[PDB]
Amino acid sequence: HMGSDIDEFDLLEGEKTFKQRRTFEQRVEDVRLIREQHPTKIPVIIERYKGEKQLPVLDKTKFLVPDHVNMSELIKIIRRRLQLNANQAFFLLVNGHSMVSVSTPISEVYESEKDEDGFLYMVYASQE
């Protein structure tokens, strides 16, 4: 009888992101200030994926990255700061996906992937 006897229930259970801490206009003004005073740097927000239990949390989520730095170098930096073991899986996701081009400047990435507010958002995880 195709599991007709089985019913579903939503199980409930019992620290804010940058977008939660700052309004859109506040973020746009931050980016304006960065563009004015640090024209060769890319504003980048890096946060831990919601629900990630393997990787620790970083002490800083807001970064200025020199234009020439590529994703491989950024991954190395973040892994070092998280103090990960060499065999630990790690992914740095931009708009939910891994970047294919890991040798190109982050400014080039920025032009494709930036948020409407002008920040570039990344999330790190031990999967995806």
Coordinates of N, CA and C in Angstrom, one line a residue:
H1 N 0.8 -1.2 0.0 CA 0.0 0.0 0.0 C 0.9 1.3 0.0
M2 N 2.1 1.2 -0.6 CA 2.9 2.3 -0.9 C 3.1 3.2 0.3
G3 N 3.4 2.6 1.5 CA 3.7 3.4 2.7 C 2.6 4.3 3.2
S4 N 1.4 4.0 2.9 CA 0.3 4.9 3.3 C 0.1 5.1 4.8
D5 N 0.7 4.2 5.6 CA 0.6 4.3 7.0 C 1.6 5.3 7.6
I6 N 2.5 5.8 6.8 CA 3.6 6.6 7.2 C 3.4 8.1 7.1
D7 N 3.4 8.9 8.2 CA 3.3 10.4 8.1 C 4.5 11.1 8.4
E8 N 4.6 12.4 7.9 CA 5.9 13.2 8.1 C 5.7 14.3 9.1
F9 N 6.8 14.6 9.8 CA 6.7 15.7 10.8 C 7.9 16.6 10.6
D10 N 7.8 17.9 10.8 CA 9.0 18.7 10.8 C 9.6 18.7 12.2
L11 N 10.8 18.3 12.3 CA 11.5 18.3 13.6 C 12.3 19.6 13.9
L12 N 11.9 20.3 14.9 CA 12.6 21.5 15.2 C 13.7 21.3 16.2
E13 N 14.5 22.4 16.5 CA 15.6 22.3 17.5 C 15.9 23.7 18.0
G14 N 16.6 23.7 19.2 CA 17.0 25.0 19.7 C 18.2 25.6 19.1
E15 N 25.9 35.4 16.7 CA 26.5 34.8 15.6 C 25.7 35.0 14.3
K16 N 26.0 36.2 13.7 CA 25.3 36.6 12.5 C 26.2 36.8 11.3
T17 N 25.8 36.5 10.1 CA 26.6 36.7 8.9 C 26.8 38.2 8.7
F18 N 27.8 38.5 7.9 CA 28.1 39.9 7.5 C 26.9 40.6 7.0
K19 N 26.1 40.0 6.1 CA 24.9 40.6 5.5 C 23.8 40.8 6.6
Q20 N 23.9 40.0 7.7 CA 23.0 40.2 8.8 C 23.4 41.4 9.7
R21 N 24.7 41.6 9.8 CA 25.3 42.7 10.6 C 25.3 44.1 10.0
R22 N 25.2 44.1 8.7 CA 25.3 45.4 8.0 C 24.2 45.5 6.9
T23 N 23.5 46.6 6.8 CA 22.5 46.9 5.8 C 23.1 46.9 4.5
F24 N 22.3 46.8 3.4 CA 22.8 46.9 2.0 C 23.5 48.3 1.8
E25 N 22.9 49.4 2.3 CA 23.6 50.7 2.0 C 24.9 50.8 2.8
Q26 N 24.9 50.2 4.0 CA 26.2 50.2 4.8 C 27.3 49.4 4.1
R27 N 26.9 48.3 3.5 CA 27.9 47.5 2.7 C 28.4 48.2 1.5
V28 N 27.5 48.9 0.8 CA 27.8 49.7 -0.4 C 28.8 50.8 0.0
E29 N 28.5 51.5 1.2 CA 29.4 52.5 1.7 C 30.8 52.0 2.0
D30 N 30.9 50.8 2.7 CA 32.2 50.2 3.0 C 32.9 49.9 1.7
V31 N 32.3 49.4 0.7 CA 32.9 49.1 -0.6 C 33.4 50.5 -1.2
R32 N 32.6 51.5 -1.1 CA 33.0 52.8 -1.7 C 34.3 53.3 -1.0
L33 N 34.4 53.2 0.4 CA 35.6 53.6 1.1 C 36.8 52.7 0.7
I34 N 36.6 51.4 0.5 CA 37.7 50.6 0.1 C 38.2 50.9 -1.3
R35 N 37.3 51.2 -2.2 CA 37.6 51.5 -3.6 C 38.4 52.9 -3.6
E36 N 38.0 53.8 -2.7 CA 38.6 55.1 -2.7 C 40.0 55.0 -2.1
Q37 N 40.2 54.3 -1.0 CA 41.5 54.3 -0.3 C 42.4 53.1 -0.6
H38 N 41.9 52.0 -1.2 CA 42.7 50.8 -1.5 C 42.4 50.3 -2.9
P39 N 42.7 51.1 -3.9 CA 42.1 50.8 -5.3 C 42.6 49.5 -5.9
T40 N 43.8 49.0 -5.4 CA 44.4 47.7 -5.9 C 44.0 46.5 -5.1
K41 N 43.1 46.6 -4.1 CA 42.6 45.5 -3.3 C 41.2 45.2 -3.6
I42 N 40.8 43.9 -3.5 CA 39.5 43.4 -3.6 C 38.9 43.1 -2.3
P43 N 37.7 43.7 -2.0 CA 37.0 43.4 -0.7 C 36.4 42.0 -0.8
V44 N 36.7 41.2 0.2 CA 36.2 39.8 0.2 C 35.7 39.4 1.6
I45 N 34.5 38.8 1.6 CA 34.0 38.3 2.8 C 34.1 36.8 2.8
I46 N 34.8 36.2 3.9 CA 34.9 34.7 3.9 C 34.3 34.2 5.2
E47 N 33.3 33.3 5.0 CA 32.6 32.7 6.2 C 32.6 31.2 6.1
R48 N 32.3 30.6 7.2 CA 32.2 29.2 7.3 C 30.8 28.8 6.8
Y49 N 30.7 27.8 6.0 CA 29.4 27.2 5.6 C 28.5 26.9 6.8
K50 N 27.2 27.3 6.6 CA 26.2 27.0 7.7 C 26.2 25.5 7.9
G51 N 26.3 25.0 9.1 CA 26.2 23.6 9.3 C 27.5 22.8 9.2
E52 N 28.6 23.5 9.0 CA 29.9 22.8 8.9 C 30.4 22.4 10.2
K53 N 30.6 21.1 10.4 CA 31.1 20.7 11.7 C 32.6 20.2 11.7
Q54 N 33.2 20.0 10.6 CA 34.6 19.6 10.6 C 35.7 20.7 10.7
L55 N 35.4 21.8 10.0 CA 36.3 22.9 10.0 C 36.0 24.0 11.1
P56 N 37.1 24.6 11.6 CA 36.9 25.6 12.6 C 36.4 26.9 12.0
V57 N 36.1 27.9 12.9 CA 35.7 29.2 12.5 C 36.9 30.1 12.5
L58 N 37.0 31.0 11.5 CA 38.1 32.0 11.5 C 37.7 33.2 12.4
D59 N 38.7 33.8 12.9 CA 38.7 35.0 13.8 C 38.3 36.3 13.0
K60 N 38.6 36.3 11.7 CA 38.3 37.4 10.8 C 37.4 36.9 9.7
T61 N 36.3 37.6 9.4 CA 35.6 37.3 8.1 C 35.7 38.3 7.0
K62 N 36.4 39.5 7.2 CA 36.4 40.6 6.2 C 37.9 40.8 5.8
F63 N 38.1 40.7 4.5 CA 39.5 40.7 4.0 C 39.7 41.7 2.8
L64 N 40.9 42.2 2.7 CA 41.3 42.9 1.5 C 42.4 42.1 0.9
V65 N 42.1 41.7 -0.4 CA 43.0 40.8 -1.1 C 43.7 41.5 -2.3
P66 N 45.0 41.6 -2.3 CA 45.6 42.2 -3.5 C 45.1 41.6 -4.8
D67 N 44.9 42.5 -5.8 CA 44.4 42.1 -7.1 C 45.0 40.8 -7.7
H68 N 46.4 40.7 -7.6 CA 47.1 39.7 -8.3 C 47.0 38.3 -7.7
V69 N 46.6 38.2 -6.4 CA 46.4 36.9 -5.7 C 45.4 36.0 -6.4
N70 N 45.8 34.8 -6.6 CA 44.8 33.8 -7.2 C 44.1 32.9 -6.2
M71 N 43.2 32.1 -6.7 CA 42.4 31.3 -5.7 C 43.3 30.2 -5.1
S72 N 44.2 29.7 -5.8 CA 45.1 28.7 -5.2 C 45.9 29.3 -4.0
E73 N 46.4 30.5 -4.2 CA 47.1 31.2 -3.1 C 46.2 31.5 -1.9
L74 N 45.0 31.9 -2.2 CA 44.0 32.2 -1.2 C 43.6 31.0 -0.4
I75 N 43.4 29.9 -1.1 CA 43.1 28.6 -0.4 C 44.3 28.2 0.5
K76 N 45.5 28.3 0.0 CA 46.7 28.1 0.9 C 46.6 28.9 2.1
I77 N 46.4 30.2 2.0 CA 46.3 31.1 3.1 C 45.2 30.7 4.1
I78 N 44.0 30.4 3.6 CA 42.9 30.1 4.5 C 43.2 28.8 5.2
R79 N 43.7 27.8 4.5 CA 44.0 26.5 5.1 C 45.0 26.7 6.2
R80 N 46.0 27.6 6.0 CA 47.1 27.8 7.0 C 46.5 28.5 8.2
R81 N 45.6 29.4 8.0 CA 45.0 30.2 9.1 C 44.0 29.3 9.9
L82 N 43.4 28.3 9.3 CA 42.5 27.4 10.0 C 43.4 26.3 10.6
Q83 N 44.7 26.3 10.3 CA 45.6 25.3 10.8 C 45.2 23.8 10.5
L84 N 44.7 23.6 9.2 CA 44.3 22.3 8.8 C 45.4 21.4 8.6
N85 N 45.2 20.1 8.9 CA 46.0 19.0 8.5 C 46.1 18.9 7.0
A86 N 47.2 18.4 6.4 CA 47.4 18.4 5.0 C 46.3 17.5 4.3
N87 N 45.8 16.5 4.9 CA 44.8 15.6 4.3 C 43.4 16.0 4.4
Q88 N 43.1 17.1 5.2 CA 41.7 17.5 5.4 C 41.1 18.1 4.2
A89 N 39.9 17.7 3.8 CA 39.2 18.3 2.7 C 38.8 19.7 2.9
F90 N 39.0 20.5 2.0 CA 38.6 21.9 2.1 C 38.2 22.5 0.7
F91 N 37.1 23.3 0.7 CA 36.6 24.0 -0.5 C 36.3 25.4 -0.1
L92 N 36.7 26.3 -1.0 CA 36.4 27.7 -0.9 C 35.4 28.0 -2.1
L93 N 34.1 28.2 -1.7 CA 33.1 28.3 -2.7 C 32.7 29.8 -2.9
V94 N 32.5 30.1 -4.2 CA 32.1 31.5 -4.6 C 30.7 31.3 -5.3
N95 N 29.7 32.0 -4.7 CA 28.3 31.9 -5.1 C 27.9 30.4 -5.2
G96 N 28.4 29.6 -4.2 CA 28.0 28.2 -4.0 C 28.8 27.2 -4.8
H97 N 29.8 27.7 -5.6 CA 30.5 26.7 -6.4 C 32.0 27.0 -6.3
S98 N 32.8 25.9 -6.6 CA 34.2 26.0 -6.7 C 34.6 26.7 -8.0
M99 N 35.6 27.5 -8.0 CA 36.1 28.2 -9.2 C 36.9 27.3 -10.0
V100 N 36.7 27.2 -11.3 CA 37.6 26.4 -12.2 C 39.0 27.0 -12.4
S101 N 39.0 28.4 -12.6 CA 40.3 29.0 -12.9 C 41.0 29.4 -11.6
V102 N 42.0 28.7 -11.2 CA 42.6 28.9 -9.9 C 44.0 29.6 -10.0
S103 N 44.4 29.9 -11.2 CA 45.7 30.6 -11.4 C 45.5 32.1 -11.8
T104 N 44.2 32.5 -12.0 CA 44.0 33.9 -12.5 C 43.8 34.9 -11.3
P105 N 44.1 36.2 -11.6 CA 43.9 37.2 -10.5 C 42.6 37.2 -9.9
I106 N 42.5 37.5 -8.6 CA 41.2 37.6 -7.9 C 40.4 38.8 -8.4
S107 N 41.1 39.8 -9.0 CA 40.3 40.9 -9.5 C 39.5 40.5 -10.7
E108 N 40.0 39.5 -11.5 CA 39.3 39.0 -12.6 C 38.1 38.2 -12.1
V109 N 38.3 37.3 -11.1 CA 37.2 36.6 -10.4 C 36.1 37.6 -10.0
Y110 N 36.6 38.7 -9.3 CA 35.7 39.7 -8.8 C 34.8 40.3 -9.8
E111 N 35.3 40.5 -11.0 CA 34.4 41.1 -12.0 C 33.2 40.1 -12.5
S112 N 33.5 38.8 -12.4 CA 32.4 37.9 -12.7 C 31.5 37.5 -11.5
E113 N 32.1 37.4 -10.4 CA 31.3 36.9 -9.2 C 30.9 37.9 -8.1
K114 N 31.2 39.2 -8.2 CA 30.9 40.1 -7.1 C 29.4 40.2 -6.9
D115 N 29.1 40.4 -5.6 CA 27.7 40.7 -5.1 C 27.2 42.1 -5.6
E116 N 25.9 42.3 -5.6 CA 25.3 43.6 -5.9 C 25.9 44.7 -5.0
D117 N 26.2 44.3 -3.7 CA 26.8 45.3 -2.8 C 28.2 45.6 -3.0
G118 N 28.9 44.9 -3.9 CA 30.3 45.2 -4.3 C 31.3 44.3 -3.6
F119 N 30.9 43.6 -2.6 CA 31.7 42.6 -1.9 C 31.8 41.3 -2.7
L120 N 32.9 40.6 -2.6 CA 33.0 39.2 -3.1 C 32.8 38.3 -1.9
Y121 N 31.8 37.4 -2.0 CA 31.5 36.5 -0.9 C 32.0 35.1 -1.2
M122 N 32.6 34.6 -0.2 CA 33.1 33.2 -0.2 C 32.7 32.4 1.0
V123 N 32.5 31.1 0.9 CA 32.1 30.3 2.0 C 33.0 29.1 2.0
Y124 N 33.5 28.6 3.1 CA 34.4 27.4 3.0 C 33.7 26.3 3.7
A125 N 34.0 25.1 3.2 CA 33.3 23.9 3.7 C 34.2 22.7 3.5
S126 N 33.9 21.6 4.2 CA 34.7 20.3 4.0 C 34.0 19.5 2.9
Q127 N 33.0 20.0 2.3 CA 32.3 19.3 1.1 C 32.0 20.3 0.0
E128 N 31.3 19.7 -1.0 CA 30.9 20.5 -2.2 C 32.1 21.2 -2.9

